[PDB]
Subunit: 293 residues, 4 copies
């Protein structure tokens, strides 16, 4: 029954140097998001979580640890999608049993699945788990484009709540809000939060909210209250930080900014580069001084 | 001199059945924009004016008729860009002698020009004419993407005013406003006016403003005033109309909507389809009844 | 150190309705390829094997069955790549222990891995197993493009043998053969076999060879012998069959063509469509009559 | 009725420093192609001729000069396509009056014309001139893709002889040859001449033939004779040269290679870079020493 509107951090995961999960570090990341970034929720097992590089057992362990640490303090969404639909169903049942408030699932990728195959994949996860479902749309990684009529076909299933929209088409975004006004949209591009919020999205899911969740909430709330001059000021500073993060290496730089606040956010998981070079550590420290001190 | 902020219709041109310019009809389009749509200005010779399908002599005739009809009641911007730099210089001189308030020029297209070639093109037109210049960026037609640092190089020429930004990258849009706060941005996607206006663009240039200019100004002014809930209601209705216009054939349907108000907006120019089928005439009359009566 | 040149079928896998592997049917597919299609080898665990939709245990089982059935009568290459490098290493070690003649790995996908990350991926699989490696390049699924210099960086590891080139850039193909004449290339687009063979590729790996292996060998051998007129006639017939297969649904139609020859090639694995409609079964029977009877 | 099969240089044009046509230089380029490169024909007014940067009067001047110089010694094809259909008709009339053996036209670009619009553009040019037509397809500059069925619809007009195929899709190329065996295909990618000739194209139109026409003919004739091994050697040397030419700047490097053989090939036309830098001149001399004796 939890309210799923608002600000969700896409949870990063602390890894050890061999790619195993650092449980102590992961708990610190969850606590930091709840207590310091003051998020409304966590989106667990998404792209940001380095999810698609992991085994099924590692994904389950992440779901277990996040929920045990968070308890019922905040809303939790579990991304369980994959090219492997039988894995998605297994993970979806697990996360449902642990009490995740909704599931979410990336459009299946690699192969060029037809729309009917995509709709069957969502319907299958829903039927096996009995849980709510949020479509996770990220066309710049998957190459999958879903149009207005196709969203409506997905929404014929009453357990589909809406879409986590990590997409840059704001005409599509407005058309979704017009066609399906009771369905939810979470914006997925942190550097375009202000314009997405201007179109009445219901929340946002972001990797950078792990370190910049305070400003993110401001942008969102001020935009929806009509305080655009102030919201734009804060989006400008946010995007100076994001531009730095992206140039330096997104996941590693957010983890370095966490480490600089005492959170043991650990290594990245190979095949991503597992650690920053010394010059890039220095650069991350300059970002910390300029934007998060 | 003139203030160049606000609502600019991308001027449609009335053609006869043989592709020649219908002067009476083109004057009627100009008068309708000034007197009924209440635009701040016209952008003449743009994609919307079917410009790239015409001869240099036809382009000159359009510039002459628009300026003669409008006189100084509104601001006028002349788009003079081409793959042919010598033509762009000739049209830029001609429009400047007519008293156009600024020039503008599409990034040169077809050949894959390098950035230094593109910059030389802008500087050459400016030096030859002595007039102001607005960069016209339309990557979805030209395939040219100009980054933040590159716009900065263009803006080293002090006669460059800004960019007519017919592009959907709202991260780039924000970054341009951060880096070059005194340079102007005009939004070019009518269906995304609200989110562009929320990022503080200075104006908008739009084909649909030839018939929907009243709503277009409302969206823009309400957004500027932080009245987002009301602006969004009007963007929604505007986008029902635009969706229908796009589906039925953009330029011909805008022309039909003008003809239904007694403006003799004429044929389209081949190789675009020159007239609407009977069924598409009926569809345009249904749009008129639903959205513009 | 088996000869890896010549004709390899990309092994299809027989599935039951519940998505499990039908072992009897998979053994039949292996036997048909060896005994009737007269392949030089099999490429096991590739895109064609529906590999990316499967669990680690399932991939292991396919490797075990293929090797138990084929023994040492043909060459076997094990595709073990994934977004999960730890799984790739686990499957690489497993296929090495089973006695596969080389490993192969798709470029890691979904995330936008840098080139250094891609090379570290190949090196980590090789150094953890000590086996040979064939780069599997399929830009139209992964969006990864590797240039000539980057191939040379990969080839600095002496256990990299060459590339399974499921790509359409015949300029790149020629430059690779020029730059690395001792390294091997297997053509991956069955419908462009003749032109790839004319540039001196060493072999080909193809899904359609599971049913069209007789013609495929003819095209390859006739081209190498300079008998282009005769090779072209056979490529034209092959491409009539391939055009029909693609239109009807690639994997399901190859499987139906196998079933029509008494091979229990089974269902496809969800989220792919698992079975042909009645109309498409009839269309496949027509292809069988026209091209394979 | 002239035979249009074989080797066609895409004629470069000699410009003065101010962008005007250097007639003396252009005649020398024509004579070099006929007398030294021993071409079958010239393709005049194409991409290579810097055509799309020029005025109608300049395009006419080039057609007049090329014909006056070539007389009846070789075949001549006039590319007259443009976004401006009226201009294309005017040029096609003029080239027809001058005696060009066929017209050719690029698919209309910039705007996103529909297929019925593209077909009408070709039929309009043909029906206003009464001359033959070659479709000029170059998706990498225009973004226009035409499929096999669509070619068939173009070929419904009996004056359409076939297609100048500057495209990399060798499956499409095969399928066109199969579907329309009496219609001609000229390859437009000089660096893929061998694999195109392997599929039975009737000729080739190329920018590099202005300087490498001897090897180009050898690759083409040896491939049609099944002498693949020798053809492939010469394609390798050819592509070493082409790689250097592309790296150094295509149009300017071909012109410099002409100048090094005593042909006054002139400047390029702005907005292309008009002259090679001293360092790039030196690189061109190294290419000359290495590949063009």
């Amino acid at each position: 029954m939890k309210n799923l509107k608002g600000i969700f951090s896409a949870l990063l995961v602390s890894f050890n140097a061999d790619g195993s999960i650092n449980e102590k570090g992961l708990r610190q990341i969850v606590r930091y998001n709840i207590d310091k970034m003051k998020v409304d929720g966590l989106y667990v097992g998404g792209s940001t979580g380095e999810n698609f590089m992991l085994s099924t057992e590692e994904k389950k362990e992440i779901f277990r640890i996040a929920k045990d640490e968070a308890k019922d303090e905040i809303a939790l969404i579990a991304q369980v999608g994959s090219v492997n639909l039988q894995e998605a169903i297994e993970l979806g049942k697990y996360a449902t049993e642990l009490g995740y408030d909704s599931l979410s699932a990336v459009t299946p990728f690699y192969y060029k699945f037809s729309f009917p195959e995509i709709k069957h994949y969502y319907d299958s996860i829903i039927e096996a788990t009995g849980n709510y479902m949020i479509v996770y749309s990220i066309p710049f990684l998957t190459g999958v484009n879903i149009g207005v009529e196709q969203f409506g076909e997905l929404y014929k299933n009453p357990k589909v709540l809406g879409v986590a929209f990590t997409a840059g088409d704001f005409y599509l975004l407005e058309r979704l809000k017009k066609a399906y006004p009771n369905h939810l949209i979470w914006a997925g591009f942190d550097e375009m939060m202000l314009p997405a919020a201007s179109l009445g999205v219901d929340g946002a899911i972001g990797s950078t909210f792990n370190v910049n969740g305070v400003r993110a909430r401001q942008i969102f709330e001020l935009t929806q209250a009509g305080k655009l001059k102030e919201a734009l000021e804060i989006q400008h500073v946010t995007n100076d930080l994001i531009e730095g993060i992206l140039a330096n290496g997104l996941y590693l730089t957010i983890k370095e900014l966490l480490k600089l606040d005492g959170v043991e956010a650990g290594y990245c998981r190979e095949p991503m580069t597992k650690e920053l070079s010394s010059e890039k550590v220095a650069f991350a420290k300059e970002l910390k001084a300029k934007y998060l001190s």
